[PDB]
Design a protein around this ligand. Structure first.
Ligand SMILES: *Cc1ccc(C(=O)NCc2cccc(OC)c2)cc1
Ligand SMILES: *Cc1ccc(C(=O)NCc2cccc(OC)c2)cc1
Ligand SMILES: [Cl-]
Ligand SMILES: [Cl-]
Ligand SMILES: [Cl-]
Ligand SMILES: [Cl-]
Ligand SMILES: [Mg+2]
Ligand SMILES: [Mg+2]
Lengths: 8, 227, 227, 8
C-alpha cells in the first residue's frame, strides 16, 4: 500500500 | 545552522535535493525552520521532501533487518535493528519537535495547517510502525488525532481535488489499513475520497487536473490492492 | 568500534550491506580493520564494497554540484560543493589511512597485496578527480605509483583471467583516460588486458569463466566508448 | 567510462 510521494 | 542566512539554507536545501543528499537537505531545512519565520508553500515542500526521504531510507533498512531478525527466531541482528530503529525514532522525534516548536501553532491558513498536521500524523505513523511496548497504543492515537484534525479542516476549507487534501486522505487510509487494523475504514475512505474528487475534476485547469488525477491514481492503486 | 568484537563487526557489515546502509558498513569494516588482524578475501571485499559505495555517492553529488557551479560562472553553490568535496576527501583519507596503517605492509600474498594497492590507486584517483591546486600532480603520481606496483605484482603472480588482475587493469585504464590525459595508454591497456584474458579462458571452470568474462565485458564497453 | 563494481 502506497503513501504519498513528495515530488512528481 | 544558526550562523547561516535563512535564504542560504533554503538555497542549499534545493541544491541538496538536486544532488540527492537528503540528510543535508533535512539539516538545512531544520536550520531554516529554527530561524523562527513561517514557511512558504515551496519551503514546506522542501522540509517534507527532505525528511520523507531520510526516514524512508531508515524504514526500508529497518524492514530488511526486522525480516532477518524474525527468520532467526547471536545478538547482532537484534542489536543492529535496534540501532537503526533508534536512529529512525530520533529523526521522527526531530520532525515532530519542529512541528510542535512552533510550525503548527503559527499555521493559520488551511494549506499550511493541514500540511503540518498531515506530517504530524505521518511521523507518528512511522513511530507506530516500530512500536511494540507500553506506548504503541498512545502513539497510534497521536497519529489518528493529527490526521483527524487535518481531515476536519480539509473537508471544511479545501475542494475535494486539492492535492494536499487528497494526499492526506491517502495517508490516513494507509494508517487505517496498516496501523489501526481497520481495512474497511481504509477502503471506505479511499473510495469516498476518489469519488468526490472525480466529481470535482470538471472545475480544474489542465495542470490542476494532472496534479489531482495523479494522486487519485494512487488511491485507486491501493483500492486495487485491498479489494 | 573498539568495544565490539571483530566477528560482530563483520557480521554487522554484512547486515548493513543487505540493508544498503553503506555508511554503517564502512564504519563496521573500519572497526574490523582497526582490530589489527589481517583480512580474509571476503573481508577485503566487504571493506572495499562499503567505501566504494560511500565515496560513490559523494562523487555523484560532487559532480552534480560542480556542474551547477560551472553553469553559474551568491557563494552558496561553491560553499556547498566545497562541503561535499571536503567530506569526500575525508573518506578517501580514511581509507588511505587504513591501507597505510597497516593493511598493505602486512599483505604478503599476491591476492591481498594487489587488492590493497588497487584500492590505494582508486582512492588517490578519487582525490585527483577533485584536485586543482598545488598537489594535483603529486596526487596523480601517487595514484599512478600504487596502480603500477599492483600491475607489476599481478603480471608476475596472477593468471591473465584473475578477476582482481582484470579489475585492476580496468581501473588503471580509467585512470589513464580520465585522470592522466593518456587515452592511448588507456586504450592499449584495455585491449592487451582483454586479449590476454581471452587467450586464457580455456583454462577456467564454468563459474570462473563467468567471473572473468563479466569483467572483460567492462573492458570492451570502455573500448567501445573510447574508439 | 566504467570502473569496476564491487559486487556481481
Ligand atoms: C501531503 C502531500 C504531499 C505531496 C503531494 C503531491 O502532490 N505529490 C506529487 C505526487 C503525487 C502523486 C504521485 C506522485 O508520484 C510521482 C507524486 C500531495 C500531498
Ligand atoms: C578490484 C576488483 C573488485 C571487484 C571485482 C569483481 O569481480 N566484481 C564483480 C563484477 C565484475 C564486473 C561487473 C560487475 O557488474 C555487476 C560486477 C574484481 C576486481
Ligand atoms: Cl549495532
Ligand atoms: Cl500564521
Ligand atoms: Cl554549506
Ligand atoms: Cl601477512
Ligand atoms: Mg538574516
Ligand atoms: Mg575479541
Amino acid at each position: 500500500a502506497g503513501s504519498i510521494p513528495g515530488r512528481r | 545552522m544558526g550562523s547561516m542566512e535563512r535564504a542560504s539554507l533554503i538555497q542549499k536545501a534545493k541544491l541538496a535535493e538536486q544532488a540527492e543528499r537528503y540528510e543535508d537537505m533535512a539539516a538545512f531545512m531544520k536550520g531554516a525552520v529554527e530561524k523562527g519565520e513561517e514557511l512558504s508553500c515551496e519551503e514546506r515542500n522542501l522540509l517534507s521532501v527532505a525528511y520523507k526521504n531520510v526516514v524512508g531510507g531508515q524504514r526500508a533498512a529497518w524492514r530488511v533487518l526486522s525480516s532477518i531478525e524474525q527468520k532467526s527466531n547471536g545478538p547482532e541482528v537484534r542489536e543492529y535493528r535496534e540501532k537503526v530503529e533508534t536512529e529512525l525514532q530520533g529523526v521522527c522525534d526531530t520532525v515532530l519537535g519542529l512541528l510542535d516548536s512552533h510550525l503548527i501553532k503559527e499555521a493559520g491558513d488551511a494549506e499550511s495547517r493541514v500540511f503540518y498536521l498531515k506530517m504530524k500524523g505521518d511521523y507518528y505513523r512511522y513511530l507506530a510502525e516500530v512500536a511494540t511496548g507500553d506506548d504503541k497504543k498512545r502513539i497510534i492515537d497521536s497519529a489518528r488525532s493529527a490526521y483527524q484534525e487535518a481531515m476536519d479542516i480539509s473537508k471544511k476549507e479545501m475542494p475535494p481535488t486539492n492535492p494536499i487534501r487528497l494526499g492526506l486522505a491517502l495517508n490516513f487510509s494507509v494508517f487505517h489499513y496498516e496501523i489501526a487494523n481497520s481495512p474497511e475504514e481504509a477502503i471506505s475512505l479511499a473510495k469516498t475520497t476518489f469519488d468526490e474528487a472525480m466529481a470535482d475534476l470538471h472545475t480544474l485547469s489542465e495542470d490542476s487536473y494532472k496534479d489531482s488525477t495523479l494522486i487519485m491514481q494512487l488511491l485507486r492503486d491501493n483500492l486495487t490492492l485491498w479489494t
